[PDB]
Design an enzyme around this catalytic site. Structure first.
Site, PDB file in Angstrom:
ATOM      1  N   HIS B  87       0.849  -1.174   0.000  1.00 33.88           N
ATOM      2  CA  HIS B  87       0.000   0.000   0.000  1.00 33.88           C
ATOM      3  C   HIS B  87       0.887   1.226   0.000  1.00 33.88           C
ATOM      4  O   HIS B  87       2.082   1.120   0.289  1.00 33.88           O
ATOM      5  CB  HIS B  87      -0.935   0.001   1.217  1.00 33.88           C
ATOM      6  CG  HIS B  87      -1.837  -1.169   1.287  1.00 33.88           C
ATOM      7  ND1 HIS B  87      -3.013  -1.213   0.596  1.00 33.88           N
ATOM      8  CD2 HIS B  87      -1.787  -2.313   1.995  1.00 33.88           C
ATOM      9  CE1 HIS B  87      -3.644  -2.342   0.862  1.00 33.88           C
ATOM     10  NE2 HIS B  87      -2.894  -3.040   1.714  1.00 33.88           N
ATOM     11  N   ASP B  90      -1.206   8.849  -1.377  1.00 33.86           N
ATOM     12  CA  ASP B  90      -1.133  10.048  -2.205  1.00 33.86           C
ATOM     13  C   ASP B  90      -2.098  11.111  -1.668  1.00 33.86           C
ATOM     14  O   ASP B  90      -3.288  10.878  -1.515  1.00 33.86           O
ATOM     15  CB  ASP B  90      -1.447   9.741  -3.657  1.00 33.86           C
ATOM     16  N   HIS B  92      -3.775  14.684  -2.326  1.00 34.92           N
ATOM     17  CA  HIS B  92      -4.064  15.717  -3.304  1.00 34.92           C
ATOM     18  C   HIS B  92      -3.675  17.110  -2.825  1.00 34.92           C
ATOM     19  O   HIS B  92      -3.610  18.043  -3.639  1.00 34.92           O
ATOM     20  CB  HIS B  92      -5.543  15.727  -3.691  1.00 34.92           C
ATOM     21  CG  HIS B  92      -5.937  14.581  -4.561  1.00 34.92           C
ATOM     22  ND1 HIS B  92      -7.222  14.511  -5.067  1.00 34.92           N
ATOM     23  CD2 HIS B  92      -5.301  13.456  -4.969  1.00 34.92           C
ATOM     24  CE1 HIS B  92      -7.353  13.387  -5.752  1.00 34.92           C
ATOM     25  NE2 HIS B  92      -6.201  12.727  -5.722  1.00 34.92           N
ATOM     26  N   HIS B 127      -5.628   9.120  -0.902  1.00 33.21           N
ATOM     27  CA  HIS B 127      -5.991   7.746  -1.225  1.00 33.21           C
ATOM     28  C   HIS B 127      -4.745   6.923  -1.507  1.00 33.21           C
ATOM     29  O   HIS B 127      -3.702   7.472  -1.831  1.00 33.21           O
ATOM     30  CB  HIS B 127      -7.004   7.677  -2.378  1.00 33.21           C
ATOM     31  CG  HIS B 127      -6.517   8.195  -3.683  1.00 33.21           C
ATOM     32  ND1 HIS B 127      -5.754   7.429  -4.539  1.00 33.21           N
ATOM     33  CD2 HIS B 127      -6.714   9.367  -4.302  1.00 33.21           C
ATOM     34  CE1 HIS B 127      -5.475   8.164  -5.625  1.00 33.21           C
ATOM     35  NE2 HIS B 127      -6.043   9.329  -5.495  1.00 33.21           N
ATOM     36  N   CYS B 128      -4.917   5.606  -1.441  1.00 31.03           N
ATOM     37  CA  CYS B 128      -3.877   4.660  -1.799  1.00 31.03           C
ATOM     38  C   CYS B 128      -3.792   4.674  -3.328  1.00 31.03           C
ATOM     39  O   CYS B 128      -4.774   4.964  -4.002  1.00 31.03           O
ATOM     40  CB  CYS B 128      -4.221   3.304  -1.212  1.00 31.03           C
ATOM     41  SG  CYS B 128      -2.942   2.057  -1.488  1.00 31.03           S
ATOM     42  N   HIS B 138      -7.756  -0.388  -5.088  1.00 31.41           N
ATOM     43  CA  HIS B 138      -7.521  -0.005  -3.702  1.00 31.41           C
ATOM     44  C   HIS B 138      -8.488   1.094  -3.264  1.00 31.41           C
ATOM     45  O   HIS B 138      -9.006   1.050  -2.146  1.00 31.41           O
ATOM     46  CB  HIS B 138      -6.059   0.390  -3.415  1.00 31.41           C
ATOM     47  CG  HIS B 138      -5.138  -0.793  -3.291  1.00 31.41           C
ATOM     48  ND1 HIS B 138      -4.273  -1.087  -2.243  1.00 31.41           N
ATOM     49  CD2 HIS B 138      -4.990  -1.793  -4.171  1.00 31.41           C
ATOM     50  CE1 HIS B 138      -3.611  -2.201  -2.525  1.00 31.41           C
ATOM     51  NE2 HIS B 138      -4.071  -2.695  -3.663  1.00 31.41           N
ATOM     52  N   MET B 143      -9.769   2.639   0.409  1.00 30.39           N
ATOM     53  CA  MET B 143      -8.570   3.298   0.882  1.00 30.39           C
ATOM     54  C   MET B 143      -8.539   4.743   0.399  1.00 30.39           C
ATOM     55  O   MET B 143      -7.816   5.093  -0.540  1.00 30.39           O
ATOM     56  CB  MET B 143      -7.311   2.602   0.384  1.00 30.39           C
ATOM     57  CG  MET B 143      -7.229   1.207   0.843  1.00 30.39           C
ATOM     58  SD  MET B 143      -5.575   0.498   0.907  1.00 30.39           S
ATOM     59  CE  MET B 143      -4.650   1.452   2.106  1.00 30.39           C
ATOM     60  N   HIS B 248     -27.146  16.937  -1.086  1.00 21.21           N
ATOM     61  CA  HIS B 248     -28.327  17.739  -0.854  1.00 21.21           C
ATOM     62  C   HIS B 248     -28.777  17.500   0.595  1.00 21.21           C
ATOM     63  O   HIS B 248     -28.862  16.357   1.052  1.00 21.21           O
ATOM     64  CB  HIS B 248     -29.409  17.331  -1.856  1.00 21.21           C
ATOM     65  CG  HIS B 248     -30.706  18.007  -1.594  1.00 21.21           C
ATOM     66  ND1 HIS B 248     -31.021  19.215  -2.171  1.00 21.21           N
ATOM     67  CD2 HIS B 248     -31.763  17.672  -0.847  1.00 21.21           C
ATOM     68  CE1 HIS B 248     -32.213  19.610  -1.713  1.00 21.21           C
ATOM     69  NE2 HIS B 248     -32.698  18.672  -0.955  1.00 21.21           N
ATOM     70  N   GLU B 272     -29.206  24.565  -3.374  1.00 18.20           N
ATOM     71  CA  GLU B 272     -30.102  23.458  -3.053  1.00 18.20           C
ATOM     72  C   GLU B 272     -29.318  22.149  -3.068  1.00 18.20           C
ATOM     73  O   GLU B 272     -29.383  21.333  -2.144  1.00 18.20           O
ATOM     74  CB  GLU B 272     -31.346  23.468  -3.957  1.00 18.20           C
ATOM     75  CG  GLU B 272     -31.160  23.047  -5.419  1.00 18.20           C
ATOM     76  CD  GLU B 272     -32.383  23.175  -6.347  1.00 18.20           C
ATOM     77  OE1 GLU B 272     -33.451  22.533  -6.116  1.00 18.20           O
ATOM     78  OE2 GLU B 272     -32.229  23.891  -7.401  1.00 18.20           O
ATOM     79  N   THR B 273     -28.548  21.973  -4.137  1.00 17.08           N
ATOM     80  CA  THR B 273     -27.768  20.774  -4.355  1.00 17.08           C
ATOM     81  C   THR B 273     -26.421  21.221  -4.892  1.00 17.08           C
ATOM     82  O   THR B 273     -26.352  22.191  -5.653  1.00 17.08           O
ATOM     83  CB  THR B 273     -28.505  19.905  -5.373  1.00 17.08           C
ATOM     84  OG1 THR B 273     -29.743  19.551  -4.764  1.00 17.08           O
ATOM     85  CG2 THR B 273     -27.707  18.675  -5.737  1.00 17.08           C
ATOM     86  N   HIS B 299     -28.248  13.455  -4.549  1.00 13.48           N
ATOM     87  CA  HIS B 299     -29.544  13.655  -5.178  1.00 13.48           C
ATOM     88  C   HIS B 299     -29.659  12.960  -6.534  1.00 13.48           C
ATOM     89  O   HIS B 299     -30.471  13.353  -7.365  1.00 13.48           O
ATOM     90  CB  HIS B 299     -29.958  15.133  -5.182  1.00 13.48           C
ATOM     91  CG  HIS B 299     -31.428  15.326  -5.089  1.00 13.48           C
ATOM     92  ND1 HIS B 299     -32.300  14.940  -6.086  1.00 13.48           N
ATOM     93  CD2 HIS B 299     -32.203  15.856  -4.127  1.00 13.48           C
ATOM     94  CE1 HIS B 299     -33.534  15.245  -5.730  1.00 13.48           C
ATOM     95  NE2 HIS B 299     -33.518  15.791  -4.561  1.00 13.48           N
TER      96      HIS B 299
END
Ligand SMILES: OC[C@H]1O[C@@](CO)(O[C@H]2O[C@H](CO)[C@@H](O)[C@H](O)[C@H]2O)[C@@H](O)[C@@H]1O
Ligand SMILES: OC[C@H]1O[C@@](CO)(O[C@H]2O[C@H](CO)[C@@H](O)[C@H](O)[C@H]2O)[C@@H](O)[C@@H]1O
Ligand SMILES: OC[C@H]1O[C@@](CO)(O[C@H]2O[C@H](CO)[C@@H](O)[C@H](O)[C@H]2O)[C@@H](O)[C@@H]1O
Ligand SMILES: OC[C@H]1O[C@@](CO)(O[C@H]2O[C@H](CO)[C@@H](O)[C@H](O)[C@H]2O)[C@@H](O)[C@@H]1O
Ligand SMILES: OC[C@H]1O[C@@](CO)(O[C@H]2O[C@H](CO)[C@@H](O)[C@H](O)[C@H]2O)[C@@H](O)[C@@H]1O
Ligand SMILES: OC[C@H]1O[C@@](CO)(O[C@H]2O[C@H](CO)[C@@H](O)[C@H](O)[C@H]2O)[C@@H](O)[C@@H]1O
Ligand SMILES: OC[C@H]1O[C@@](CO)(O[C@H]2O[C@H](CO)[C@@H](O)[C@H](O)[C@H]2O)[C@@H](O)[C@@H]1O
Ligand SMILES: OC[C@H]1O[C@@](CO)(O[C@H]2O[C@H](CO)[C@@H](O)[C@H](O)[C@H]2O)[C@@H](O)[C@@H]1O
Ligand SMILES: OC[C@H]1O[C@@](CO)(O[C@H]2O[C@H](CO)[C@@H](O)[C@H](O)[C@H]2O)[C@@H](O)[C@@H]1O
Ligand SMILES: OC[C@H]1O[C@@](CO)(O[C@H]2O[C@H](CO)[C@@H](O)[C@H](O)[C@H]2O)[C@@H](O)[C@@H]1O
Ligand SMILES: OC[C@H]1O[C@@](CO)(O[C@H]2O[C@H](CO)[C@@H](O)[C@H](O)[C@H]2O)[C@@H](O)[C@@H]1O
Ligand SMILES: OC[C@H]1O[C@@](CO)(O[C@H]2O[C@H](CO)[C@@H](O)[C@H](O)[C@H]2O)[C@@H](O)[C@@H]1O
Ligand SMILES: O=N[O-]
Ligand SMILES: O=N[O-]
Ligand SMILES: O=N[O-]
Ligand SMILES: O=N[O-]
Ligand SMILES: O=N[O-]
Ligand SMILES: O=N[O-]
Ligand SMILES: [Cu+2]
Ligand SMILES: [Cu+2]
Ligand SMILES: [Cu+2]
Lengths: 338, 338, 338
Positions: B87, B90, B92, B127-128, B138, B143, B248, B272-273, B299
């Site tokens: 494993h 990373d 972002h 995430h992996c 993964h 993950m 939502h 709203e969304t 939604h």
């Protein structure tokens, strides 16, 4: 307790919108609307496929309701005894009680009256939401529409300038999930209840069989094309209660677009294609510059051309050769070309 | 070489968030976190379906890490010898070396220490990402998590006004791809390795079998509903490492939304969304105005109701009849109606 | 009638872009481009799968055309007599006549000349659109590209500061729908016409078999990686004519992103992942801070890793240990850990 003037509004069938003012100097009113649930078999494509729809006021989408910020919206929801299911209504524009769904559940033979205050400006979805798996089923069976809450001063461009539309159209987009038999033919049912189990199976795979505007493939083409004139500012309200859409006006642009649909945010300018999140409404203003046919589509072109999601505008006026011209018509390729 | 104060943070399991300050007058610190990989069979739906998960710290999503702009984040990643696969991690939020993935690959029985500087504000996915087809596998096995990098002055509305949250919840949304047998029953496996080939086949068709918050259908409903009070400003951080989502709050709104999740950009107001792009985190602030049950959903209502993607908020307080009221309870339709 | 200087532009194959100025003090010109339709069998994946493509200028995507606001764009479209189908071209940047599609339909053996005025700034899609079901089919067969209309002063950050790129790459993303036989093997055809009916059936299920950059899986990896240097500002133009994409630079960010692709709107800053609506182009500026390999992906990681949608950047320079460092290399977990 609430002592304001009352004003009854008569809704009209989409894509048209009931009469309303943009800017208003009137104070807050109680705006009264009635919505009647109608379960009925409807034709949804050009080969005559039918499905067991469930609608507000007999149409997909349900009608657009237009009010101003600070108004109170009093909605009578009626579920006639000819219907077979309980229904309700949830307004994304409203605050509390699951948008009103928790206060409006009615059996066939009943009606209910909900009042909500229009505190938030924009275009918003409303839809039926009876509970659990019934929520998606009712929505994708057609029980959804939109409400527009205008600022009292009307629209603006977010930089101090008023925007006014000459015409407004409401385009409701509906994803449908029609069961097929083993040869791939669409199945028909005698009631919504009978269609449920097969429909749920299609819904679970998340791929619609049809994506339509105004309730059927080709609804807003041919003689039901939307009309405009060169120089007119047209507002196009677009809703999608369940699935994303990417509106595009072929041969045009979105001059001013509120893709999230909320007028407290400045619009984006000069878009080619915009994005309506499933569960939302958005709005685009465009001033036609050229006459002719325009196609309004979702720009998944498979959906647009093969699943039903194309509308037409027919625009009257004079052609502007400065903006676009055919310099040389189709001709044979010169033999002396490389 | 790097001579700053060190501060060990103890992570907590989502949807809760470890203790942290919003605005701070402290200078840059080295914030130390530890993440331990755990491969384990987990229940992911209300009928008891299991799947071979892979997690950071035993949870889907992995915990939220909170630091401030200019901090250095020192992460110890541990891959216990009871695991079967390599494993890595990373971020972002980090710059270079594939977000750290290129520096953190560890076999079972190993650990590694990465340091990255928090130069960019916002919420971000981690995430992996072990390489090639292992990356999606993964991630969709669980993950993934998120990190929040706050400005030192805390949040603002993009127009010079401070925003402060009373409570914060992290909702990690996970798309799962569980293999089915020929009758449609979900298959079970004794290890992740054994599940791989069948899982890859489902993944290739891009349609999840389940879409869950906090690792299982119904995780944040019933007695695990999220609590709030009328008048409280609640920040909801939402991540999706692989697939788009459209959050939502049913009966509510997003007062201030950073849908792309980055605090250098002004929030949108009154949504709203909203829309979380797959591979990103976003955040929404809302001040509850009404008590009662709220459903927080994606939604796409099919996903929300039928694939597992619904959470509940239980909000304590007094009902505001000005905002919404039932004017007349369900009653028989008047015989004298047309 | 139109009396401006004419300037012939020679297009180049993506991901490269023909020579152009960013800021210009030149006045409006008539910029002349030629596009030649080529139908041909192409390899689209690393196992050698072929499909019947249809292209502008022999490439997927078609080349990027770069002009400035106020220019007139005069495009000669040629359909050689070796092709089997009619083709045309619609520019999302242009106003009227379905973006020019209504004026450019040509049979094999013909050519046509269209002129449109570049009144709207941004990056825009162009694509073939012959009519009805042929529209999606031509587009997903490869007949799409993009045009960039720069402001005369070049890019700006929306807050009065000039932005200049050192390098520009055009990444066209293509969703493909390749028919399979009963065992799941991809089918091959001797002509586009013969592939049509089977392809349409795949298209109707809305799930691509492949999602590629620059026309094939692995096109922009290995020796065709894109080059940059630490400190260079790189503009990445990304288009998707039919389906949404969510670009992400692994190990990097979008410093300035116009995700809707229109330069009249201020860019968003510091994004992790952005969103290209199907039917649109967008653009992202990033200044590389670290050397090494970067993967540019759509952050549906299933698509990225398993369906072909990964490109590589190879960045030359010196590593910055302040931004990121491996504090301790992989080592055995201390026996004295809990
Ligand atoms: O006989 C099938 C044939 O008839 C059509 C004609 O419009 O419609 C019928 O069959 C459909 C499929 O069951 C139904 O949806 C419809 O309600 C019924 O009238 C065609 O659509 C169909 O191919
Ligand atoms: O913003 C429109 C409208 O919403 C209300 C609540 O009904 O206020 C919300 O949004 C305000 C502006 O962002 C917030 O400051 C406030 O805390 C939040 O409840 C109305 O008061 C306002 O007019
Ligand atoms: O779609 C599969 C298969 O079904 C057939 C009839 O067996 O057509 C059905 O599906 C078509 C696409 O949705 C519809 O156009 C038509 O109305 C419906 O009967 C075949 O034609 C097709 O191969
Ligand atoms: O309004 C479109 C309609 O007008 C006609 C003539 O009535 O032609 C005009 O529009 C064309 C582009 O669609 C121009 O090329 C032409 O010069 C202009 O006169 C029809 O041809 C067209 O359908
Ligand atoms: O016997 C099948 C039946 O048992 C349940 C009960 O919770 O779970 C078992 O079977 C599932 C399908 O293989 C597995 O995912 C699970 O691990 C196993 O305990 C039901 O889910 C299932 O229908
Ligand atoms: O913007 C946040 C943060 O990112 C850095 C690089 O780590 O700067 C990037 O963004 C700046 C503002 O947009 C750009 O001007 C700069 O060129 C780019 O590297 C930091 O310097 C900045 O604090
Ligand atoms: O989904 C197809 C088919 O499979 C069955 C069992 O044969 O149920 C499976 O799929 C359901 C939907 O995902 C799950 O609710 C259930 O846990 C699973 O076994 C049938 O019930 C269904 O028709
Ligand atoms: O907090 C919601 C909860 O409160 C109750 C009474 O305890 O009713 C309140 O909320 C209703 C809307 O959900 C209002 O219509 C009612 O007037 C108000 O007193 C419960 O009914 C409700 O579940
Ligand atoms: O024999 C099938 C085998 O050959 C390959 C080798 O590159 O390609 C051939 O078969 C494919 C499937 O029909 C075609 O797309 C291709 O045009 C043809 O050369 C493999 O891809 C394939 O598995
Ligand atoms: O905005 C760019 C460009 O578009 C034109 C029409 O070609 O104007 C449109 O957008 C203007 C700015 O929003 C609107 O005010 C105008 O009404 C609309 O046609 C050009 O005039 C302008 O330069
Ligand atoms: O995808 C189903 C099935 O088909 C096989 C060959 O029978 O492989 C095909 O599909 C694969 C995934 O798209 C491709 O990698 C390969 O090129 C293609 O022939 C099986 O391997 C697979 O189980
Ligand atoms: O440019 C990346 C390349 O450079 C090398 C040495 O040539 O290492 C540098 O980059 C690493 C991170 O990818 C740093 O950890 C290292 O300290 C730095 O010297 C290669 O290892 C690497 O592939
Ligand atoms: O509530 N309707 O099934
Ligand atoms: O430009 N329309 O697809
Ligand atoms: O690296 N894991 O399979
Ligand atoms: O309003 N909720 O679906
Ligand atoms: O027009 N092409 O099939
Ligand atoms: O961070 N890349 O998936
Ligand atoms: Cu209903
Ligand atoms: Cu892993
Ligand atoms: Cu074509």
């Amino acid at each position: 307790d609430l002592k304001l003037p009352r004003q009854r509004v008569d809704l009209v069938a989409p894509p048209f919108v009931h009469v309303h003012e943009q800017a208003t100097k009137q104070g807050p009113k109680i705006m009264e609307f009635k919505l009647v649930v109608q379960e009925k078999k409807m034709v949804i494509d050009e080969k005559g496929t039918t499905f067991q729809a469930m609608t507000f006021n007999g149409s997909m989408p349900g009608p657009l309701m237009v009010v101003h910020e600070g108004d109170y919206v009093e909605v009578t929801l009626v579920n006639p005894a000819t219907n077979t299911m309980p229904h309700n209504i949830d307004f994304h524009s409203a605050t509390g009680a699951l948008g009103g769904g928790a206060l409006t559940l009615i059996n066939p033979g009943e009606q209910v009256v909900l009042r909500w205050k229009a505190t938030r400006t924009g275009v918003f979805v409303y839809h039926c939401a009876p509970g659990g798996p019934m929520i998606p089923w009712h929505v994708v069976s057609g029980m959804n529409g939109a409400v527009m809450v205008l600022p009292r001063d009307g629209l603006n461009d977010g930089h101090g300038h008023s925007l006014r539309y000459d015409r407004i159209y409401y385009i409701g987009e509906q994803d449908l999930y029609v069961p097929r038999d083993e040869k791939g033919n669409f199945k028909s049912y005698d009631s919504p209840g009978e269609a449920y189990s097969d429909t749920e199976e299609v819904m679970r795979k998340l791929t619609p069989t049809h994506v339509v505007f105004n309730g059927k493939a080709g609804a807003l083409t041919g003689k039901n094309a939307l009309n405009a004139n060169v120089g007119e500012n047209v507002l196009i309200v677009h809703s999608q209660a369940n699935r994303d859409s990417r509106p595009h006006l072929i041969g045009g642009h979105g001059d001013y677009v509120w893709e999230t649909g909320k007028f407290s945010n400045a619009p984006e300018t000069g878009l080619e294609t915009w994005f309506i999140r499933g569960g939302s409404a958005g709005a685009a203003l465009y001033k036609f510059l050229q006459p002719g046919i325009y196609a309004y589509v979702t720009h998944n072109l498979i959906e647009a051309a093969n699943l039903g999601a194309t509308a037409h505008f027919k625009v009257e006026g004079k052609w502007n050769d400065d903006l676009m011209t055919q310099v040389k018509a189709p001709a044979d390729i010169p033999t002396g070309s490389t």
